[PDB]
């Protein structure tokens, strides 16, 4: 129980010994603690007289310190400040320990009493630092630290301990005076006195640096320097700043370094994209993507370039692409593969960029130079269709199965962007038919994998026809096995009979003209009729002879020639075997073949030079064979091989078949849109015409995109089919 007058002189001497760093002994510290305890344990609570002296001493000491760091130079004071701050903090902590008792006996009592304006002793030292030394010197020290940060940004390294000390002091001076119990790092004064100034200085300095670099350096080096600046700024925040600056500084630097020049970025982008600098595009995307929703229009720019490049790609192919599908599909696939490689590495496989790639690929696949040359978009998938036929035709070269699977996968990838998928379906079905009925296919597992890929791409009903084509050819193979087993069991025939039974609905085929079956061929045809009557009487057959080959012996010549030809050619050869002089009208009345195909088969026979006209001096390759024109078999002709193939396509019938396929897919399109509008209009019953066609486009966009005259024609067809009624006056709305 000792009054403050006796205690205070010794206590002040000890506290001044603490603050002036001389490494005060432990005994003096415990003696000061004893002094404070014996004073406090002497009104109800007596700490105000002690607190006032501590408050006044700290005010007096800091004012005496402020004179030393009043107006020294900017680079000096900061160092000074840091040093003083460090010692002050340490001294205050030691001081706190003494008034640790004052932190429990009296300060807690005042906080419980509600009398504000009072603090714990360490917080008191911090607060009186915030009001006697930090406030007048704050502008000078923050200007100095901004100058030193500018110096470090310019290139000259400097001691980061000074900056870290200043920022740590700025963080620690933020105190919640009203609620000291509310813990956590309070950054009120750090944001109010440093963050604003630092952010403004960073804005100004990067504005100046970016403008100078654009005016004195190319764009790509500016991208390099800007990425370096952003990484260095993350380093600066990480090393000697606060954590909370990381988000705000990164946003501000992205807004001032990349955003405000973003327009000129586009000015480089396409030009950069003109040079195919994949790494530079990668850097470009990496920097641009830090701005939210800034890629968007830029993204679209990529799309446009790809489309342009695609058109130029077709311009590299020229007229040959209209008749050589391999180069056309290879060119389109090469452009798609190159841009997929560029978007999967430089652009990090962005979903928006992949969507732009797909949109551009569709835009130059469905309509490009060859489609303009053929004045129709339907040439775009058909050529692709022909391409896959070229990868399934059994040629002399034998492609490897693995690379065949890879390139069929690439073909499927190209086909994914086809709009007119039904045209490709019909053309592939026709080419698969032409391959299978002549058993001229490649490895069967490749065919099965291609069919499975088409199924996975477009559902079941897209290739259900092809799947039933395969099951039908398997059934036909088994039926041929049954026929040969039965004929080995029964009486033997005269020829090797290898019929391929075919389905009348799935396979796209047209029945040719009638035919005069040979008697020895009729003797086997009747046996086959008895065979199928025994096996299955519930089926009927048509027996078209347009696609039916076979080798026949050639006794009425030099030796045995086993050349094979078409059924019409075999009929003509047998008719000449009966009598070696026949007119065109005679062949017409004998074989019962209509004029056009008979003329075609006769002119390809004359092209094969197996037999000659009645006059040798007469034309062969440019003669129109009238019905009265006589032809005599040229017995003097010699064949270089025992087996000679004559079944080669004619260009006229090739074009006729192609336009027939176009007409067939046109009528299939009409039937499909008719059935689709019938199925749709029953659901709504009130929907108007433009909305109806929009809904049709949405539902069958996965199949094709019809032209609006076809839509109007289908609308008229369904109007005068009386399935649904139209509204008089208002022709848009319909009803059922």
């Amino acid at each position: 129980q000792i009054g403050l007058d006796q205690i205070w002189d010794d206590l002040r001497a000890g506290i001044q010994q603490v603050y002036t760093r001389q490494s005060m002994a432990k005994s003096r510290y415990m003696e000061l603690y004893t002094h404070v305890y014996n004073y406090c344990t002497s009104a109800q609570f007596v700490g105000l007289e002690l607190y006032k002296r501590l408050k006044e001493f700290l005010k007096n000491y800091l004012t005496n310190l402020l004179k030393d760091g009043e107006d020294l130079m900017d680079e000096s004071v900061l160092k000074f400040y840091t040093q003083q701050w460090e010692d002050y903090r340490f001294s205050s902590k030691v001081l706190n320990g003494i008034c640790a008792y004052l932190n429990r006996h009296w300060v807690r009592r005042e906080c419980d009493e509600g009398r504000k304006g009072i603090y714990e002793i360490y917080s008191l030292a911090l607060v009186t630092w915030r009001d006697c030394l930090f406030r007048p010197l704050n502008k000078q020290v923050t200007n100095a630290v901004l100058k030193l940060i500018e110096k470090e940004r310019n290139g000259e390294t400097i001691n980061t301990r000074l900056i870290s000390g200043v920022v740590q002091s700025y963080v620690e001076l933020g105190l919640n005076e009203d609620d000291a119990f509310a813990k956590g790092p309070t950054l009120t004064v750090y944001k109010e006195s440093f963050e604003s100034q630092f952010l403004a200085d960073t804005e100004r300095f990067y504005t100046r640096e970016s403008t100078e670099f654009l005016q004195q350096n190319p764009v790509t080096e500016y991208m390099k320097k800007a990425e370096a600046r952003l990484l260095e700024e993350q380093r600066r925040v990480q090393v000697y700043l606060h954590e909370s600056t990381q988000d705000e500084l990164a946003r501000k630097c992205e807004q001032v370094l990349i955003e405000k020049h973003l327009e000129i970025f586009h000015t480089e982008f396409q030009n950069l994209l003109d040079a195919d600098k994949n790494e530079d595009l990668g850097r470009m995307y990496n920097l641009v993507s830090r701005i939210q929703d800034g890629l968007g229009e830029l993204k679209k720019l990529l799309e446009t370039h790809i489309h342009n490049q695609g058109l130029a790609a077709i311009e590299k192919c020229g007229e040959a692409a209209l008749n050589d599908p391999k180069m056309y599909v290879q060119t389109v696939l090469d452009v798609h593969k190159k841009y997929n490689a560029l978007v999967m590495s430089a652009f990090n496989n962005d979903a928006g960029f992949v969507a732009a790639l797909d949109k551009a690929c569709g835009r130059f696949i469905n309509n490009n130079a060859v489609t303009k040359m053929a004045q129709s978009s339907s040439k775009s998938p058909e050529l692709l269709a022909r391409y896959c036929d070229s990868l399934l035709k059994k040629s002399s070269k034998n492609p490897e199965e693995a690379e065949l699977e890879d390139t069929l996968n690439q073909v499927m990838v190209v086909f994914k962007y086809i709009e007119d998928k039904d045209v490709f379906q019909k053309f592939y079905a026709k080419m698969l038919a032409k391959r299978l009925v002549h058993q001229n296919s490649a490895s069967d597992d490749a065919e099965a994998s291609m069919i499975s890929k088409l199924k996975q791409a477009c559902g079941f009903e897209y290739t259900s026809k092809l799947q039933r084509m395969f099951q039908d050819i398997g059934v036909s193979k088994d039926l041929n096995e049954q026929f040969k087993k039965h004929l080995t069991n029964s009486e033997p025939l005269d020829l090797d009979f290898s019929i391929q039974v075919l389905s009348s609905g799935s396979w796209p085929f047209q029945q040719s003209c009638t035919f005069a079956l040979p008697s020895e061929l009729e003797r086997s045809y009747q046996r086959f009729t008895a065979f199928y009557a025994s096996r299955h009487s519930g089926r009927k057959l048509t027996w078209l002879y347009q696609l039916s080959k076979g080798e026949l012996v050639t006794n009425c010549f030099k030796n045995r020639y086993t050349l094979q030809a078409s059924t019409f050619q075999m009929a003509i050869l047998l008719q000449y075997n009966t009598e070696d002089a026949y007119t065109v009208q005679q062949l017409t009345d004998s074989t019962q073949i209509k004029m056009d195909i008979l003329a075609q088969v006769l002119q390809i026979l004359l092209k094969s030079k197996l037999l000659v006209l009645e006059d040798e001096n007469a034309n062969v390759d440019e003669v129109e064979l009238k019905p009265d024109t006589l032809i005599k078999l040229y017995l003097g002709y010699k064949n270089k091989k025992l087996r000679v193939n004559i079944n080669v396509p004619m260009k006229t019938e090739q074009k006729q078949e192609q336009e027939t396929t176009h007409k067939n897919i046109e009528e299939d399109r009409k039937l499909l849109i008719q059935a689709a509008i019938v199925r749709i209009m029953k659901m709504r019953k009130v929907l108007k015409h433009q909305q109806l066609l929009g809904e049709v486009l949405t539902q069958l966009s996965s199949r094709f995109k019809p032209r609006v005259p076809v839509i109007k024609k289908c609308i008229d067809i369904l109007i005068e089919k009386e399935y649904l009624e139209r509204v008089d006056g208002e022709k848009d709305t319909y009803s059922y």
Partner: peptide, 16 residues
């Protein structure tokens, strides 16, 4: 004379 030894054909199965 002409003799037949091999001739493949295609027939269209149609459900009635």
């Amino acid at each position: 004379r002409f003799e037949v030894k091999k001739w493949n054909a295609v027939a269209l199965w149609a459900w009635d």
